[PDB]
Design a protein around this nucleic acid. Structure first.
Ligand code: K
Ligand code: K
Ligand code: MG
Ligand code: MG
Ligand code: MG
Ligand code: MG
Ligand code: MG
Ligand code: MG
Ligand code: MG
Ligand code: MG
Ligand code: MG
Ligand code: MG
Ligand code: MG
Ligand code: MG
Ligand code: MG
Ligand code: MG
Lengths: 54, 242, 195, 50, 74, 39, 48
RNA sequence: AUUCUAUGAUUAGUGUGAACGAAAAUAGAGCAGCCUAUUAAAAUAAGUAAAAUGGCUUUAAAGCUGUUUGAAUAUUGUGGG
RNA sequence: UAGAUGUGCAUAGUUAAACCGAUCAUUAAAAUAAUGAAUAGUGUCUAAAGUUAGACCCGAAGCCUGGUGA
RNA sequence: CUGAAAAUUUCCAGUGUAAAAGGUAAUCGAUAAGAUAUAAUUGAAACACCUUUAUUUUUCUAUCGUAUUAUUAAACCUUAAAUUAAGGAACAAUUGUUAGAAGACAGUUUAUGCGGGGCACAGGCCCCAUAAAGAGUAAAUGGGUGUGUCUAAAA
RNA sequence: CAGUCGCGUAAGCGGGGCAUAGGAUCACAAGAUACAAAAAGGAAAGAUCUUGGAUUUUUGGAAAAGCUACGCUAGGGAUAA
């Protein structure tokens, strides 16, 4: 009946395991927008760009 | 001697805010009998902003117009869907007979007149071209007063509302007295969003966050607004009237 | 301008829901119309106070009935009000056409529909009181009673005006005393300083 | 999902999606003419209407 | 505000026995400064310390601890 | 421990706890076998 | 103080970055670089 | 249970370094359990446990401690580790 | 009579490390694509040695603690 | 800037001590008259009234901080076998914590190189010669205004 | 060699600059890796990879002022009169 591995208990998982799916979904979400983001960058220009990360 | 770089921000824990419908119930009573065309609401939104920062000087084109400087009257078939659609757009008058008899009296409550593609014939039969000529209100395609689409033109002849931040507040009208809660509601959401959109568009150094939203009339008291919309009293329900 | 400043100035002006002229009108009524002059002359002061004192208290408890006013410049105009009491046993007629308020008499008293019977009430050189009671007894309506919290609202703001008027005169006595003292000295030094 | 497969969703390797001109220069010329034709023909009808 | 503050003593629980004015009536339980109880009341037999044993004999519990009434006057 | 249980709970190692698994269940105590299809 | 070291962050949200120097009185850097996590060339933008 | 010797151990670990340095367990020497203690003691433990702060010890735990504060009632899961 | 018992080293390598394993590690997926690493130990004696102890021997000025003396 | 009530905001002109903006064409006057305001004038900006904010100044409340007073009315302290005495007094004093602070006192450092040492000066890196036709090669040897940089490429 | 981008008809070139003048560890900070996780589930603190801030200029990297003619010890004549 110990924490996690006992009868009825459920393992919690490490932080990098609980956030694994949300981690890969964020990278997938970004690549899908990569083409449209490069077009805006190659169109607006390297100098007039202002949408920088934070 | 002392100085601060901020605008005084009071504590709202004890404030008494009102819902939009509950508030209009208090205001509509103080404006009993007042000309609805000369009585308009107003909103003062206090912002937690620094004195040194910049100011807002953008414009907003509300769904329904509030300024009564350009009163537009349309001529559509009586009872048609355009009649009610015209009122939902900001039309002061929409009809053939009601307008024909109104202009024949000698007093025109409006300053501009339009004619839809469906009421072209009946116009000349009313025998009124001799009336609108001198006043220059003769609806003609030369003035682009005849159109099949209405909302497409109502956005140019009327204009766009202007708002400016003077000192930690922004003051501008939001609707006339005759505005129904449904029309007045969206008329406010368009104003708050355009602001919050311009704030985020601004720099991130000092994001100006809203603190309170007030609502009053030209002769009414300044009351606080709650995000809610429906009345707290279960007996009352959304009711529209003069 | 604190939140409590604006709060006390509001809750005092919220006497609309009070005893003087508030009452729950019956569903039999349909709409109201009134017409009077701008100024107070030739018996026209009565309706004005009825419009600024008791009439607003009806729309709060009766926000569904339209109460319109039609002002005019003709001081001799008939200060009379019509009450569309009859709704044809609540038959719900289609009374779509109805005017709106104005200031030049542009919205006179329209003719009632078939299922409507108006009730005329004259008022000229008569006090609002006699005009008010004539409205309730004729238009049978139950008068709403205030709650204990409303009695505290009247009692609180009443005691407040005591402290206010006590201060209105006090601060007035310090400014004039200064405006007076600042003058006595001006007549002494600033008078000879001109040379 | 492997990170390399997540990168090959936009397209096959060898090119950078978003860098290749989507429209053909010849097509832009054909469109530039049609717009001009309608403008010239537009004045024709408006002149004939007058 | 802070997550840690200076630790202070609220007082000692006592039960009056002489109906002291300005503090409370007879048999009144409340917390009072330790100085007054240790130097003024206890020597004159005006009150008594409310120990966990004293609660049991009197049948009371910790819920009976009241407050000082500065308005009390015999 | 989690690791020790998962080791003897999978049939790849012929663990003496593998009989506790279902034919479609995973040995991990946290991870699960995702489902394939259009949904 | 005339020169600063900036960090160009991958817009693929992989967490990879490049570091380059550029004068303070210059516009932020933005380049198309190779990301070894996704193994493709993506857009890299300056951190701040 | 305690005590003594050896191994564990130039180990875990600490430390910028130089160095410092356990325990479990094992083997041997001895072996003894009790409160009615083979000498005469408990009505089962509250300013205590514990916390903040200043120190000692130390691996950050545990243990010792000045100052200021300050709990609970037993596996029917109360308290310490 | 029988059973058990008593340090350790080696017997498999590889990596920062585990999983893994005659294969392992890096290659953000993997794959003879590339590079590195695989086969007798253990005990004793004799002798020479590294380390820690006075550490091949002799030799300070001085520092600290406790006592002695007008 | 804890909050309430009330009030105050003067460059010239301007009917006059214009706080600012947004909105208004009406508001006030118990029934008879007129005062405000809008207009017109002045000015960059024009006023009642309803609102929402800004500056400054009084009282009140709240919070801090000082200042004084009382205390056998048994804190504590002093004289005093030590008291219903006298005086001081919520200070002082002591404990803990915190900050400043005397070489008064303690420990240690203050180097090394150098045609003796002291003073001074020097300490990494780059190019040329010295260098004797591979490379290397010293001296408080000689050359040098050498050097701890610059550089995202475009309008 | 693998990965994937640029220029070029093509062959091919490209892992900064015609060449020769910018210091580590530790600690700290920002990203990634999924390694281990002191009963167990987590975490903390660690490990690996990338990266950043140094007259650490006595620049293989101490936080550091003098007098002694009142001077002392060990040595050198390996450097003086
Ligand atoms: K613990
Ligand atoms: K091994
Ligand atoms: Mg105290
Ligand atoms: Mg170690
Ligand atoms: Mg016990
Ligand atoms: Mg303790
Ligand atoms: Mg501890
Ligand atoms: Mg303990
Ligand atoms: Mg005294
Ligand atoms: Mg000294
Ligand atoms: Mg040579
Ligand atoms: Mg040679
Ligand atoms: Mg654990
Ligand atoms: Mg060196
Ligand atoms: Mg070197
Ligand atoms: Mg001498």
């Amino acid at each position: 009946r110990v924490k996690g591995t006992g009868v009825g208990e459920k393992v919690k998982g490490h932080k990098h395991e609980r956030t694994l799916v949300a981690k890969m979904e964020k990278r997938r979400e970004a690549m899908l927008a990569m083409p449209d983001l490069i077009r805006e960058w190659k169109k607006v220009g390297k100098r007039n760009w202002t949408k920088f990360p934070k | 001697k002392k100085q601060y770089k901020f605008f005084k921000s009071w504590d709202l824990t004890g404030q008494q805010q009102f819902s939009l419908c509950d508030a209009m119930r208090y205001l509509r009573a103080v404006e009993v009998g007042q000309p609805p065309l000369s009585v308009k609401y107003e909103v003062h939104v206090k912002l937690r902003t620094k004195k040194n920062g910049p100011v807002v000087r953008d414009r907003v084109r509300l769904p329904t117009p509030v300024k009564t400087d350009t009163r537009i009257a349309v001529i559509c078939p009586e009872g048609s869907a355009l009649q009610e659609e015209a009122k939902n757009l900001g039309a002061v008058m929409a009809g053939e007979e009601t307008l024909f008899e109104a202009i024949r009296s000698g007093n025109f409550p409006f300053n501009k007149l339009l004619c839809h593609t469906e009421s072209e014939g009946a116009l000349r039969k009313a025998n009124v071209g001799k009336l609108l000529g001198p006043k220059g209100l003769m609806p003609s395609g030369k003035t682009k007063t005849i159109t099949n689409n209405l909302e497409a033109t109502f956005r140019d002849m009327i204009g766009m509302d202007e708002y400016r931040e003077r000192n930690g507040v922004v003051r501008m009208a939001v609707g006339q007295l005759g505005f129904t809660p449904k029309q007045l509601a969206e008329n406010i959401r368009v104003f708050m969003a355009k602001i919050k959109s311009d704030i985020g568009k601004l720099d991130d150094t000092t994001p100006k966050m809203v603190e309170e939203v007030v609502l009053s009339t030209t002769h009414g008291p300044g009351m606080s607004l709650n995000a809610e919309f429906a009345p707290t009293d279960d007996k009352i329900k959304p009711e529209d009237l003069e | 301008v604190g939140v409590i400043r604006r709060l006390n100035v509001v809750r005092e002006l919220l006497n609309i829901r009070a005893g003087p002229g508030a009452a729950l009108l019956p569903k039999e009524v349909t709409k109201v119309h009134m017409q009077f002059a701008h100024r107070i002359e030739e018996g026209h002061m009565g309706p004005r106070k009825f419009w600024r004192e008791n009439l607003p208290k009806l729309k709060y408890w009766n926000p569904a009935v339209p109460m319109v006013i039609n002002r005019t410049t003709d001081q001799k105009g008939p200060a009379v009000m019509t009450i569309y009491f009859r709704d044809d046993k609540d038959a719900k007629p289609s009374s779509t056409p109805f005017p709106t308020s104005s200031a030049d008499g542009s919205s006179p008293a329209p003719k009632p529909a078939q299922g409507e019977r108006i009730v005329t009430i004259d008022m000229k050189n008569r006090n609002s009181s006699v005009i008010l009671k004539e409205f309730l007894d004729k238009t049978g309506a139950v008068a709403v009673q205030p709650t204990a919290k409303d009695e505290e609202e009247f009692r609180e703001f009443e005691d407040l005006h005591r402290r206010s008027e006590i201060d209105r005169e006090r601060i007035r006595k310090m400014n004039d005393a200064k405006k007076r003292e600042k003058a006595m000295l001006a007549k002494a030094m600033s008078d000879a300083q001109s040379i | 999902e492997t990170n390399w497969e997540i990168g090959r969703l936009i397209g096959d390797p060898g090119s950078v999606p978003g860098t290749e001109k989507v429209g053909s220069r010849k097509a832009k010329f054909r469109a530039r003419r049609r717009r001009r034709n309608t403008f010239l023909l537009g004045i024709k009808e408006r002149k004939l209407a007058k | 505000a802070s997550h840690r503050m200076r630790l202070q003593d609220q007082g000692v629980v006592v039960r009056l026995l002489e109906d002291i004015p300005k503090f409370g009536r007879k048999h009144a339980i409340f917390r009072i400064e330790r100085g007054r109880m240790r130097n003024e009341w206890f020597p004159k037999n005006k009150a008594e310390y409310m120990t966990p044993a004293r609660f049991q004999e009197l049948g009371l519990t910790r819920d009976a601890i009241g407050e000082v009434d500065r308005s009390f006057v015999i | 421990s989690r690791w020790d249980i998962e080791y003897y709970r999978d049939p790849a190692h012929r663990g003496y706890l593998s009989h506790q698994l279902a034919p479609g269940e995973s040995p991990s105590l946290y991870f699960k076998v995702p489902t394939g299809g259009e949904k | 103080s005339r020169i600063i070291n900036v960090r160009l962050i991958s817009m693929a949200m992989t967490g990879y970055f490049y570091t380059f120097t550029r004068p303070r009185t210059s516009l932020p850097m933005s380049m198309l670089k190779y990301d070894p996590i996704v193994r493709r060339k993506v857009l890299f933008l300056e951190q701040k």
